[PDB]
């Protein structure tokens, strides 16, 4: 046909991914920043006992 499309306007794809690299973008960027948060979780407090939130 005349031009080139991505062809996903009304297809209902999961999180709008149609190249599998887009799903690894979703997992890579979430996973990179989950890991930065997880390693940095030692500076956030060890809320280990049961009554250890901001409560009233």
């Amino acid at each position: 046909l005349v031009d080139e499309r991505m062809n996903g306007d009304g297809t209902g794809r999961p999180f709008g991914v149609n190249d599998p690299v887009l799903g690894w973008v979703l997992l890579g960027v979430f996973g990179t920043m989950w890991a930065i948060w997880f390693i940095g979780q030692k500076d956030l407090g060890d809320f280990e006992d049961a009554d250890d939130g901001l409560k009233l």
């Binding site: 046909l1 499309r5 062809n7 996903g8 306007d9 009304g10 297809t11 209902g12």
Partner: protein, 46 residues
């Protein structure tokens, strides 16, 4: 896609794909162009 490959899809599968904007390619059949039988034909799905 051929004509039968289009008609073997439901409406929600062909929707939003751009397949609906295309003519069916004629994958079977040859370029001999003579075994077309002479005479009149009413021409649908043109």
């Amino acid at each position: 896609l051929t004509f039968d490959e289009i008609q073997g899809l439901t409406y929600l599968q062909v929707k939003g794909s751009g397949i609906a904007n295309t003519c069916p390619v004629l994958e079977s059949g040859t370029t001999n162009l003579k075994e077309l039988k002479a005479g009149s034909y009413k021409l649908e799905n043109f």
